[PDB]
């Protein structure tokens, strides 16, 4: 009878309030913490009152109706949120689509700078407030964050503080832990955003093909029915989270974990560790679980997908099912391939059938279909060996610099902060993937590149500046990384006029932590490319090295600002000449 009462009962007050706080924090990203808390309470009160009597007036209403209504009660709505006040005129489901349109993927709130001393205070004083504030701060910065997973990270955040606040040195215990968690948040946010972006820009079909590939690699022991079952269920979970249906998303996610763990012997040997854990840890562990050992009994695939003389009938009758089976089969056999590569391979398999079956003798045509994959494997394997050999020679910073030069040339109309963010992210892929066992690099590299390129595309949706970026972002999800890689210098771009202040440093840089020092330098590097787009990466590397030396010198000076004042302009003048 009442969906809100039902969900409150399934989920419990703690998680219910957690998810509702996250939901409201993502839709309304500028509201102060105390405004959202009270909205959560009001809605939770309504749920308890409905749970007492489901036939009561308004308890029949949908979750979108009840949450949307509550968000539209908020004080100073039209002033703080001009556009969302317009959404409040509309009824559901129109109102929710409108809300979703207005989520801000670049809110530009301050960095969460961890103050161990002042935070341990607030955690001791009121943990429910302090833990709650963490949900709100992370969620508003990442408005598409996977809600149940954010409740999970809040539990790690609680645990870091529980361990580190009683200790003598708060910083040395806590800082490395909070730094690790911020990295995990970044990555996880980027994973969920790609899933939402796929729904948005390519629909549920692409989300399913993607999931079939990955889950098949993860669970090669599972049969096509079990894989299909989990994909269907997992797809509905993320469709709900991305659509904002956060309570439904959490409940269906718990259910799927239960199913998976009930059939763990069938699905995968690696689940045993995951399935002996509390529910949030459980689901997290399943989502991140290592791929299973390859089964000895895997079938030869030529006979069904190449030699069978009735493939054109199977393909014509049940295109969706037949190709699904191919993708499942090929992917469970290839955990050494990236997901995108498998989806390129699947598309090539389909293309080979479309062509061969329209022609007189299809069996002779499609007999060589597996051999059309060989070329597609080479291009990404070289790209990874090439960029891993560079990473290992030069290290993270210079690698990031290579990538910032490379992407700024591809899209010099993009804002410097975006180019710097993406280049840095693309460069962290080296630190994550190149150290790994050699079979794991390709999937790791390409999978993490997909996350970073989606971030570029998501920002480009907001602030479109480049026809080239648009095409790569919108054409084909699978072809996206190869499309980007194939861009050379944009030669319709007009060199940005030189502005001395852009390349002018002052002694303020010297106090900054190292990562922020690099960002300034890297920002100047992006600006160098925009000014001199035809300059080779090797010229730019030399000029930036001269800037770094200059900076290192004047930071080490007695009269720091007099050094920047005299030495700075000289280097600015001669920097122009080395880029011609």
Helices 319-332, 170-218: axis angle to 10 degrees equals 130
Piece in contact with Zn ion (CB under 5 A), picked from 114-122, 132-140, 235-243, 423-431: 235-243
Residue count, binding to Zn ion (CB under 5 A): 2
Residue 103 binds Zn ion (CB under 5 A): no
- Please indicate if the annotation marks 252 as binding a ligand: no
Piece in contact with Zn ion (CB under 5 A), picked from 6-14, 237-245, 523-531, 549-557: 237-245
Residue 259 token pair: 């199913």
Contacts of 240 (CB under 8 A, 6+ apart): 246, 248, 249, 252
Site string for Zn ion, 503-522 (x = CB under 5 A): --------------------
- Please indicate if the annotation marks 168 as binding a ligand: no
Site string for Zn ion, 536-555 (x = CB under 5 A): --------------------
Q: Which is nearer to Zn ion, 243 or 496 (CB)?
A: 243
> What is the distance between the alpha carbons of residues 225 and 560, in angstroms, rounded to a whole number?
68
Q: What does each C-alpha distance from 429 to 50, 55, 569 come to in angstroms?
A: 49, 54, 36
Contact 5, 47 (CB under 8 A): yes
Contact 211, 231 (CB under 8 A): yes
Cβ at position 100, least distance to Zn ion in Å:
9
Piece in contact with Zn ion (CB under 5 A), picked from 115-123, 245-253, 365-373, 515-523: 245-253
- Please indicate if the annotation marks 251 as binding a ligand: yes
> What is the distance between the alpha carbons of residues 85 and 292, in angstroms, rounded to a whole number?
50
Cβ at position 245, least distance to Zn ion in Å:
4
> What is the distance between the alpha carbons of residues 209 and 380, in angstroms, rounded to a whole number?
20
Cβ at position 349, least distance to Zn ion in Å:
34
- Please indicate if the annotation marks 514 as binding a ligand: no
Piece in contact with Zn ion (CB under 5 A), picked from 33-41, 241-249, 313-321, 337-345: 241-249
Q: How many CB atoms lie within 10 A of CB 172?
A: 11
Cβ at position 147, least distance to Zn ion in Å:
13
Cβ at position 96, least distance to Zn ion in Å:
6
Piece in contact with Zn ion (CB under 5 A), picked from 240-248, 253-261, 325-333, 544-552: 240-248
Piece in contact with Zn ion (CB under 5 A), picked from 132-140, 244-252, 394-402, 531-539: 244-252
| Helices within 219-245 (DSSP H only) | 224-243
Contacts of 408 (CB under 8 A, 6+ apart): 414, 419, 423, 526, 529, 530
Residue 245 binds Zn ion (CB under 5 A): yes
Residue 468 token pair: 């080239």
Q: Which is nearer to Zn ion, 196 or 306 (CB)?
A: 196
Contact 357, 315 (CB under 8 A): yes
> What is the distance between the alpha carbons of residues 243 and 196, in angstroms, rounded to a whole number?
8
Cβ at position 247, least distance to Zn ion in Å:
10
Q: Which is nearer to Zn ion, 245 or 251 (CB)?
A: 245
Cβ at position 248, least distance to Zn ion in Å:
8
Residue 248 binds Zn ion (CB under 5 A): no
Piece in contact with Zn ion (CB under 5 A), picked from 151-159, 243-251, 513-521, 570-578: 243-251
**Chain gaps in the chain, named by the residue before each (C–N > 2.5 Å):** none
> What is the distance between the alpha carbons of residues 257 and 279, in angstroms, rounded to a whole number?
8
Cβ at position 261, least distance to Zn ion in Å:
27
Backbone φ and ψ for 491, nearest 5 degrees, come out as -95, 0
> What is the distance between the alpha carbons of residues 102 and 119, in angstroms, rounded to a whole number?
32
Cβ at position 236, least distance to Zn ion in Å:
11
- Please indicate if the annotation marks 245 as binding a ligand: yes
Determine if residue 318 is left, alpha or beta; phi over 0 gives left, psi from -120 to 50 gives alpha, anything else beta: beta
Q: Which is nearer to Zn ion, 177 or 243 (CB)?
A: 243
Q: Which is nearer to Zn ion, 253 or 480 (CB)?
A: 253
Residue 252 binds Zn ion (CB under 5 A): no
- Please indicate if the annotation marks 293 as binding a ligand: no
- Please indicate if the annotation marks 64 as binding a ligand: yes
* Location of structure tokens 């409740």: 151
Q: Which is nearer to Zn ion, 245 or 252 (CB)?
A: 245
Residue 243 binds Zn ion (CB under 5 A): yes
> What is the distance between the alpha carbons of residues 131 and 122, in angstroms, rounded to a whole number?
10
Contact 35, 266 (CB under 8 A): no
Contacts of 394 (CB under 8 A, 6+ apart): 402
Query: Which residues define the annotated binding site for Ca(2+)?
Result: 3, 10, 240, 245, 248, 251, 255
Bind-site residues: 3, 10, 64, 240, 243, 245, 248, 251, 255
List binding-site positions for Zn(2+).
64, 243, 245
Site of interaction with Zn ion (CB under 5 A): 243, 245
């Amino acid at each position: 009878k009442s969906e809100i009462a039902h969900r409150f009962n399934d989920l419990g007050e703690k998680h219910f309030k957690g998810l509702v706080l996250v939901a409201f924090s993502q839709y309304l990203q500028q509201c102060p913490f105390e405004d959202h808390v009270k909205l959560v309470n009001e809605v939770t009160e309504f749920a308890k009152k409905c749970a007492a009597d489901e036939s009561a007036e308004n308890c029949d209403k949908s979750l979108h109706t009840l949450f949307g209504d509550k968000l539209c009660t908020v004080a100073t709505l039209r002033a703080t949120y001009g556009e969302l006040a317009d959404c409040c005129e509309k009824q559901e489901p129109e109102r929710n689509e409108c809300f979703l349109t207005h989520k801000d993927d670049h809110p530009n709130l301050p960095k969460l700078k961890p103050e161990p001393d002042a935070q341990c205070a607030a955690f001791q004083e009121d943990p429910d407030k302090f833990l709650g504030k963490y949900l709100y701060e992370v969620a508003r910065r990442h408005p598409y964050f996977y809600g149940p997973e954010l409740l999970f990270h809040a539990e790690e955040y609680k645990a870091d503080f529980t361990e580190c606040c009683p200790a003598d040195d708060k910083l040395a215990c806590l800082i490395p832990k909070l730094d690790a968690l911020k990295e995990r948040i970044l990555l996880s946010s980027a994973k969920e955003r790609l899933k939402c972006s796929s729904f948005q820009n390519f629909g549920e079909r692409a989300v399913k093909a993607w999931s079939v590939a990955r889950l098949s690699q993860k669970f090669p022991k599972a049969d096509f029915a079990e894989v299909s079952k989990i994909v269907t269920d997992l797809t509905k979970v993320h469709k709900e989270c991305c659509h904002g249906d956060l309570l439904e998303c959490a409940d269906d996610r718990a259910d799927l974990a239960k199913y998976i763990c009930e059939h763990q012997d069938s699905i995968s040997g690696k689940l045993k560790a995951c399935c002996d854990k509390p529910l949030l840890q459980k689901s997290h562990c399943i989502a991140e679980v290592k791929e299973d050992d390859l089964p000895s009994d895997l079938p030869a695939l030529a006979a069904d997908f190449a030699e069978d003389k009735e493939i054109c009938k199977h393909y014509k009758d049940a295109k969706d099912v037949f190709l699904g089976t191919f993708l499942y089969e090929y992917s469970r056999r290839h955990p050494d391939y990236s997901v995108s590569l498998l989806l390129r391979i699947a598309k090539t398999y389909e293309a080979t059938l479309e062509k061969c079956c329209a022609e007189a003798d299809p069996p002779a045509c499609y007999r060589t279909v597996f051999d059309q994959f060989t070329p597609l494997v080479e291009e990404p394997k070289s790209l990874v060996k090439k960029n891993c050999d560079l990473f290992e020679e030069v290290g993270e910073y210079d690698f990031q610099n290579a990538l910032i030069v490379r992407y700024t040339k591809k899209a010099p109309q993009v804002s410097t902060p975006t180019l710097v963010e993406i280049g840095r992210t693309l460069g962290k892929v080296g630190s994550r993937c190149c150290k790994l066992p050699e079979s794991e690099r390709l999937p790791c590299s390409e999978n993490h590149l997909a996350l970073a390129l989606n971030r570029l595309c998501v920002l480009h949706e907001k602030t479109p500046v480049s026809e080239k970026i648009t095409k790569c972002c919108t054409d084909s999800l699978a072809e996206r990384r190869p499309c980007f890689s194939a861009l050379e210098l944009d030669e319709g771009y007009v060199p940005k006029e030189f502005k001395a202040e852009t390349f002018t440093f002052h002694a303020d840089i010297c106090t900054l932590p190292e990562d922020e020092k690099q960002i300034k330098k890297q920002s100047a590097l992006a600006e160098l490319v925009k000014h001199k787009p035809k300059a080779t990466k090797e010229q730019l590397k030399t000029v930036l090295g001269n800037f770094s030396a200059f900076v290192a010198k004047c930071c080490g000076a007695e009269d720091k600002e007099a050094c920047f004042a005299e030495e700075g302009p000289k280097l600015v003048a001669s920097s122009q000449l080395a880029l011609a």
